[PDB]
Assembly symmetry: C3
Homo-oligomer: 336 residues x 3
């Protein structure tokens, strides 16, 4: 409430980690409200999104696309120190959909290269929320250049299902889905540029068609496959947080389900259950809780299979454990 | 139920107002069921939809894009007098998604220029509902030319949250979102036509691309911005009714939330809460309730930011009142 | 659990029927769990999808687009004998979104032309689910070639509303919606190919536009109209199961509503009510229950009206019975 009361609150410095991993945290809040501090440096950098060497001039929070997931509990204060190095060429800011006021913080955080700012907001509503840059007049360009992420505001008492039973996860992963619009020369080959501003004009043109050239998880085709496939074990309870700051998505765990899905991403809105495919509108984050029952590889995809398999929206899960023949079994293997 | 009963009902004429404003009404029903009378005249006229002077041959109920919001209470009868002036060149009708029978009323209301008709229907289900023109054979064309609106059928006892607690708004706004498909010549310049019919062929080709050239609120880019921005004050409860008769939208109040959102637009379906971004499918209306907590300018947009900032789907809210530093504060303003 | 306990379970072979019809079944379970057997033969065949004679080298389960609806009860075992004829040229498999393990069964059912296989899985979650072919590396191509359908796992106690009140339908229809991507020549005319292979490259290009040339019900424009229109009567309770394995859809019954809609298709997730237009994300099936109140023709459509009336997503209902003037009446017929 009063400035004095907040000043008396305990503070905690949090160390952020690159997605799909999430920084250390407790599901059930340990203590009364606290002022949780985070710091992120913005990095304008070239990223290679496919095996054809296609480049995107990314604008990354903390150096990754998407930016890192920040975890706090309801009614804590999130205090972010955002830094825009002199090495950058553009003005940047940040809008937290979890925050109330000044365009989510964007109106208070406009920093040119060489500046920094510290914003504090009370995480009044529990749920997963998108955050992204939004420089007046250059909003979609920064967002589709990968300048977005999400935060999770856990209820103090952790997650619960619709009937109040607790839902405690064993593992948590953050999948940030991105729609990229890469210009092509007259031959159909993606163009490369020597600077962000150089690509601007060409990129806006592709954007207006509303047809992405690539739709990827964690910044590139295959990011979350192979050496980067997510893992779990049969019997493990996993929470998958998924965000899309500009375009709709329809997550689906091939071989599994969304046991409980907070499709709107808001914990006070009861989760849907036994989901095959859920929907997350552009501009929101959602969360799915599932207990693995079968070992093997799974594919986590945006279920418009063209986007998943032609455009790049596909990730994998490698699960260990014993096969359950009651759930599924090959009565007759493929034969003549 | 019986003949005598329906005939005995009080009749009440209501004067409509142009969106985003809504005609005078009471949230909780005043008295018993009545036959609520409305009259709308159809206007076919050229309108400028952007800052470049792009013209469109609009087809509008009451002359506005979207058509006005009609408000009744559950179990009232809505009796509409629809007039199609002889000066018009096309046949028109109306489909009330709130109505039951004859294609929503479209089958009983086909009027050529020079004709009028009166349709009555019992508003049996509570919620916000889309209404639109639907001449057989050219349904899409009339709808994407601006011929659609919405009605609100309030529960006789007003709005309530998930657990029976009353939700009373101080104001209500109706934002109608329109996807336009304007043809361009070989040079990329939008084309102008003499009569509506002349644009038909070229328009359908653009429509089939499923990519609108414009996505606007209240009929034009910036229609709900600047001096035409909607208003509120800290502590004020606002209901925003939003509709899209042909294409999906994902509404978001930048700097705010949808405290209670009947995303499906139906009041018997519990509203979602603490929403960051909600989803309204094409062919439906939705409603969001919010109590403002911070003063300043807000942007209400379709969260596909390319559609919001490149195509036109962005409106403003100007809110007066005191800033709340507990909710948000700039600890360190942008500095070196 | 053990193969012995499942083998001791009663077995029942079912004869599938072509959509939109559904094979015989009981809403409330007939005794205890059983192994329900189904068989489907895959056929690669050319089909005509519109009145201009446009053809598609379809890949169809049971020779139909969509494949037929399999109906079982929660905790029953679905045992499918899938056959891929010598006459076929491609390998096919099946992924049941209702199943748990091996990519929905897809990794255990890869059969080359001249092969067959038998997969059994426990239908552990109640709801309607999509099933589709998914040959690694050629997933979207098989799906958008028509190789998908849906199954319904009814609660053992039949359907119930969100409050436990029983919901028994008189009729049921299965509407499979298909997005087709047909290449066109320099004259804008759809192309025809000798072998499905010759079409691959051109089709992939169209697929990458994320813009289908046709969006149809039961494999063709107008397939569920005329003498093929669905039927009902005033007072009749009808359940419509709708699926879209690759792309979003927003169903709407013109002139009616979705009284209870399991928009996510999962029966343990309470249905929305009084729906005007609902939403089914690509990769999912949904179900809507409605009691007809008015006689006449109804159009059941995907509510992006361009997809419905330009692309092919519109079906009809012919309803017999008496007109209800209380619900709707033409006070004044179109006149001067
Ligand atoms: O289950 N994925 O197509
Ligand atoms: O929440 N506005 O991009
Ligand atoms: O109500 N469907 O156009
Ligand atoms: Cu930025
Ligand atoms: Cu935003
Ligand atoms: Cu009209
Ligand atoms: Cu409609
Ligand atoms: Cu196949
Ligand atoms: Cu699938």
């Amino acid at each position: 409430a009063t400035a004095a009361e907040i000043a008396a609150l305990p503070r905690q410095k949090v160390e952020l980690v690159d997605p799909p991993f999430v920084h250390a945290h407790s599901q059930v809040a340990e203590g009364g409200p606290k002022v949780v501090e985070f710091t992120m440096v913005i990095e304008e950098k070239k990223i290679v999104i496919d095996d054809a060497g296609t480049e995107v001039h990314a604008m990354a929070f903390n150096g990754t696309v998407p930016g890192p997931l920040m975890v706090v509990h309801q009614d804590d204060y999130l205090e972010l120190t955002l830094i825009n190095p002199e090495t950058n060429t553009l003005m940047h800011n940040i809008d937290f959909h979890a925050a109330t006021g000044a365009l989510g913080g964007g109106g208070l955080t406009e920093i040119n290269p060489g500046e920094k700012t510290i914003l504090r907001f009370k995480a009044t509503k529990p749920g997963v929320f998108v955050y992204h840059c939004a420089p007046p007049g250059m909003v979609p360009w920064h967002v589709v250049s990968g300048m977005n992420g999400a935060i999770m505001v856990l209820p103090r008492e952790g997650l619960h299902d619709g009937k109040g039973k607790a839902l405690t996860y064993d593992k948590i992963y953050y999948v940030g889905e991105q729609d990229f619009y890469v210009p092509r020369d007259e031959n159909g080959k993606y163009k490369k540029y020597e600077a962000p501003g150089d690509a601007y004009e060409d990129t806006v043109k592709v954007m207006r068609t509303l047809t992405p050239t690539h739709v990827v998880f964690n910044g590139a085709v295959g990011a979350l496959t192979g050496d980067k496939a997510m893992t779990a074990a049969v019997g493990e309870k996993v929470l998958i947080v998924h965000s899309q700051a500009n375009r709709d998505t329809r997550p689906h765990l091939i071989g599994g389900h969304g046991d409980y899905v907070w499709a709107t991403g808001k914990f006070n809105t009861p989760p849907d259950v036994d989901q095959e495919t859920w929907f997350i509108p552009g501009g929101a984050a959602g969360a799915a809780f599932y207990t693995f029952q079968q070992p093997g590889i799974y594919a986590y995809v945006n279920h418009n299979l063209i986007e998943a398999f032609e455009l790049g929206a596909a990730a994998h899960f490698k699960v260990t454990g014993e096969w359950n023949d009651d759930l599924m079994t090959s009565v007759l293997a493929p034969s003549g």
